[PDB]
DNA sequence: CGCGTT
DNA sequence: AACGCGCAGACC
């Protein structure tokens, strides 16, 4: 749930979405070709970019424009990261943001043939140009029910539900998502259980498990008394740790062998 | 039995009826209103039984 | 009878709509709905129709 | 200094009725005038209504203590 | 009305207590800052 | 971003708008009407879905069903 | 497809229910009015966070929830100034009393303050404004039965002094007890348990 | 980065101040909610080798009723804090009568440092917190209800009242984020207050073990 | 396999 | 240079 002014307008929410979603070179790149141009000033390709800027080999990694504009990146920071990631060992010449082709030139200075292949492969498979891991892709849907719209008691007294933008991710992090600015660090749940136990607390886990169980059981319109759900959650969160309902979670309690064998692992517990 | 009091809505009850007139006198014979254990108005269905 | 005529007209309209959706998808006009791909949005529109 | 609930739980009531019916079936002195019935369960129910069953329930608590209640002492539900 | 007035005066006394707490906090910070200075 | 030409700036703005529109999610469909009053916000606007007559609050967002 | 789905559902739900039952087959409410397992480990100080059975509970609405401040004020304040309305509702032997006696006026003002406090508590407790809540006794049905039995006839001036209603509600709240005990902690737990109902 | 580092430092300082206030350590109501303009104006807003350097923004707050009790909040610059740093901190702390401290590490301290931390425990209590966890306050989270660290007197009162052994109460490991937030340790009961939809408010207890 | 300590 | 551990992987 967006907290700042980004919650109302979508312009200042796309940036939050981009910074939360995982972007990599494999996403903002179109083609990659390894060339053996001997002299940098020779330039086997027709590109007037090295002479202005000034090893017998390089990699031309031409980036796409639409994806770069969607993620709102700049070759400056891309090159900064691609240099800081590998140290002061490479010299990645970038291109201005005026030409049509978003070409690059990765060169190494100080087996060498395959080294460029290996390095390009391991930077393309993962680089993290702007985003956090785990989170694959983030959505952007408006809240249609009261379970997500913002609620605020006006001066007159009425609740008056407000329709604010909200992002629906696909991974788990929470620790890194709540820290981002323009993100409500109060209403941003997680949908997972172990994640809430590691992030918030055992009591937050009990509340979250209750909500998820209620949701999955009331999704079909049915109704179950809250007492049964609360009792189940309490039995699961009594011993602090989230005791699993399976054998591995129930047979660990100090109940007794006559009761543990009644369930499972008969001969073992005996 | 007894003096039971309850109100229930019939299945084929138009929602745009309580707002307009004929609230306590439904033309379609809906709005089950039992008083002192005596059916007065409305038809019985799963919503009432 | 008249119910049958209405049902046949509705089915013919639905067929025409799905044929138009197919023609649009072939000629490349149906833009991808946000959050869904081209085939996904085509199937969604056909199913909704 | 008894803290348990003053009402008769359904479990206690059912068990007391069954036990009194069994004691009656084994030829035991009744605690109420019989109007003309012979079913021991019905006699136990009548005895419960009259509040004359000579039984006291020993309700145990989680700690280990126990409170002894009387059918004529605590209030009956049904 | 006099009851409202004495309630107002009690609120004023609470505000004075807030002021005295603030002045004590400042009087202790004026000395605690030296330990933070010598620490570095 | 500020030094680019007018055509380049217009293209960048259009691309950004297209990306923002595609990243969004399709709103849930339904028959919007003001005949049902939502008990969670007291508003009249809402949507109805027949499949079981489910009601989705429009402004307040009250969720309910009628049989 | 439907037949296969039914078969797999019947095959999985069986194991699910078996595990759910073996996890809590021992939990039970003790005579100390607290839920515990076979190891006497407290799972709930009071069953269902209230100490009430799930059978005698029905759905009801919270009247003081999601109101408009002005609507709530004019509906739950009992104006003891409109002598015409006071005569219309109560009787002459009570209008003069509610006008002269100021102790009654102070008591009603204190009652309204308590009503406002409970409304704020509900608002901060039930976010999103959900009036539908499960409670034991259905007070609306009870009031309706009382009317139909005693033949109230809603039209003539009734004979019920507000001080009587206030003292009756207070005595009833004192009677309904869950955590028996004059201890400060006992009283705090009793109040917290029967809060929503009161 | 410069601005981002300053924003993270400011957020961490705010979280530490709120944590200290919840535990009981008297903190200025001003610093308890200061914004970032004053943070800049006080420090410098040039963490990239400038004035706002770590170890200088450390804070020493004293407990409310016990002015003789205080606690430091260090901010080592070493990403992977070692043992020489904590050793020198304890050696410099040994001068004063303080006992409690709190380390805020950039990255996870080496396992060898935790050994010394628990070894120096009975004489000087010190616990570590990652910056990644301090950037957000979990107590203000919707799920996290209200917690209270009770005292031995009222704990014994509760036990004697309920005629229940402390071992029977629910459990909450000390490694719990909220437990570490409150600084509670083994053998201590925390009170939890929850909005129960079937009883307004519901109060429960959990012993740390 | 990597860090840090002895 | 060898040992204390911890994460990841592999294997059962």
From Swiss-Prot, chain E:
Job description of the protein: Component of the PAF1 complex (PAF1C) which has multiple functions during transcription by RNA polymerase II and is implicated in regulation of development and maintenance of embryonic stem cell pluripotency. PAF1C associates with RNA polymerase II through interaction with POLR2A CTD non-phosphorylated and 'Ser-2'- and 'Ser-5'-phosphorylated forms and is involved in transcriptional elongation, acting both independently and synergistically with TCEA1 and in cooperation with the DSIF complex and HTATSF1. PAF1C is required for transcription of Hox and Wnt target genes.
Residues of the signal peptide: none
Coiled-coil boundaries: none
Protein's name according to its UniProt entry: RNA polymerase-associated protein CTR9 homolog
Assembly description: Component of the PAF1 complex, which consists of CDC73, PAF1, LEO1, CTR9, RTF1 and SKIC8. The PAF1 complex interacts with PHF5A. Interacts with KMT2A/MLL1. Interacts with STAT3. Interacts with SETD5. Interacts with ERCC6.
Tissue-wise expression: Widely expressed.
Localization per record: Nucleus speckle
UniProtKB/Swiss-Prot annotation, chain F:
Residues annotated as binding Zn(2+): 38, 41, 57, 60
Protein location: Nucleus
Keywords, sorted A to Z: Acetylation, Chromosomal rearrangement, DNA-binding, Isopeptide bond, Metal-binding, Nucleus, Phosphoprotein, Transcription, Transcription regulation, Ubl conjugation, Zinc, Zinc-finger
Any one GO molecular function term: zinc ion binding
Keyword Ubl conjugation assigned: yes
Residue ranges covered by zinc fingers (TFIIS-type): 34-65
Chief location of this protein within or outside the cell: nucleus
Gene Ontology cellular component terms for the protein in this record: nucleolus; nucleoplasm; nucleus; transcription factor TFIID complex
The organism's place on the tree of life at top rank: Eukaryota
One biological process term in Gene Ontology: transcription elongation by RNA polymerase II
Quaternary structure and partners: Interacts with EAF2. Associates with UBR5 and forms a transcription regulatory complex made of CDK9, Pol II, UBR5 and TCEA1/TFIIS. Part of TBP-based Pol II pre-initiation complex (PIC), in which Pol II core assembles with general transcription factors and other specific initiation factors including GTF2E1, GTF2E2, GTF2F1, GTF2F2, TCEA1, ERCC2, ERCC3, GTF2H2, GTF2H3, GTF2H4, GTF2H5, GTF2A1, GTF2A2, GTF2B and TBP; this large multi-subunit PIC complex mediates DNA unwinding and targets Pol II core to the transcription start site where the first phosphodiester bond forms.
Purpose of the protein: Necessary for efficient RNA polymerase II transcription elongation past template-encoded arresting sites. The arresting sites in DNA have the property of trapping a certain fraction of elongating RNA polymerases that pass through, resulting in locked ternary complexes. Cleavage of the nascent transcript by S-II allows the resumption of elongation from the new 3'-terminus.
Disease linked to the protein: A chromosomal aberration involving TCEA1 may be a cause of salivary gland pleiomorphic adenomas (PA) [181030]. Pleiomorphic adenomas are the most common benign epithelial tumors of the salivary gland. Translocation t(3;8)(p21;q12) with PLAG1.
Protein name according to UniProt: Transcription elongation factor A protein 1
Protein source organism: Homo sapiens (Human)
Gene name, Swiss-Prot/TrEMBL: TCEA1
